[PDB]
Chain A
Amino acid sequence: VSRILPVAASYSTVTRFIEEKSSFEYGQVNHALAAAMRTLVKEYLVLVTQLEQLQRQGLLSLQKLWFYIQPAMRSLDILASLATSVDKGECIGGATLSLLHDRSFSYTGDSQAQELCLHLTKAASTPYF
């Protein structure tokens, strides 16, 4: 459960961060970050609901959940690391775009993280662009 707890902690942190960066004083850039994160969180919650459907089926195991939560754990880790970086750096604007390019070069090599960050970076730079 402690190993699973990491993804749930990421979920709670993401909820908090999408709430915090939702402010217009946090910028429409932070608003877009939180909106994309909200889409991803909707995906995660839909996955949670599907897993709950499997639990109503009575056909889930800690291994099955954890194995089902393994890619989920990785995705949540990527998203939560991005959120922690955005919050600790307080990037808003050109700093945010610079950090986006930097972290994209850092998440390069991992195709899942690279592709998700690429989609997020395109969406977020659309406003600044």
Chain B
Amino acid sequence: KSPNVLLQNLCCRILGKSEADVAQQFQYAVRVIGSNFAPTVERDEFLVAEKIKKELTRQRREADAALFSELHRKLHSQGVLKNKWSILYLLLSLSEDPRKQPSKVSGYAALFAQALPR
């Protein structure tokens, strides 16, 4: 239940090995986590969803984007958490694109929008 206990168990699962077997990996992850414990950018799921849809279109997955938007509507209807933005950011960072070949154009955040920090 402790954040450290959760980290140890998650490292064991990610490595498929013991926590002591991931102790060095666990140590690196612990260093990374204690480096920053809170997000430096606020939670505004409108922009997060906009980025998700933009990525889906960049993946030529407009139908999948519509399915995702409908899922977002259903999930916000089943809202049970208050900081979903972080979970959404995690899902976007965990997202992979086997549906498209690897080639992308760089976006902007200062010509485009940069997250005003929280």
Contact = CB atoms under 8 A, between A and B. Distances in A.
A101 interface: no
A26 B13 CA distance: 59
Q: Interface size bucket, A side?
A: 20 to 34
A47 B47 CA distance: 8
Interface of B: 44, 46-47, 50, 105-106, 108, 110-114, 116
A54 B46 CA distance: 12
A19 to B, nearest CB: 21
Interface stretch (A2-10, A67-75, A83-91, A92-100): A67-75
B113 A78 contact: no
A46 B108 contact: no
Contact of B44 (A53, A64, A72): A53
A50 B46 contact: yes
A40 interface: yes
Nearest to B108: A116
A123 B46 CA distance: 27
Interface in A33-54: 40, 43-44, 46-47, 49-50, 53-54
A47 B46 CA distance: 10
17 contacts: A40-B111, A43-B112, A43-B113, A47-B112, A49-B46, A50-B46, A54-B116, A64-B116, A72-B113, A74-B110, A75-B111, A75-B112, A78-B111, A112-B108, A112-B111, A115-B108, A119-B106
Interface of A: 40, 43-44, 46-47, 49-50, 53-54, 64, 68, 71-72, 74-75, 78-79, 112-113, 115-116, 119, 122-123
Given A115-B106, A119-B105, A47 B111 contact: no
Contact of A50 (B44, B106, B110, B111): B44
Contact of B110 (A40, A49, A64, A112): A112
A123 B107 CA distance: 13
A72 B105 CA distance: 21
Given A50-B116, A53-B44, A71 B50 contact: no
A112 B108 CA distance: 8
B90 to A, nearest CB: 20
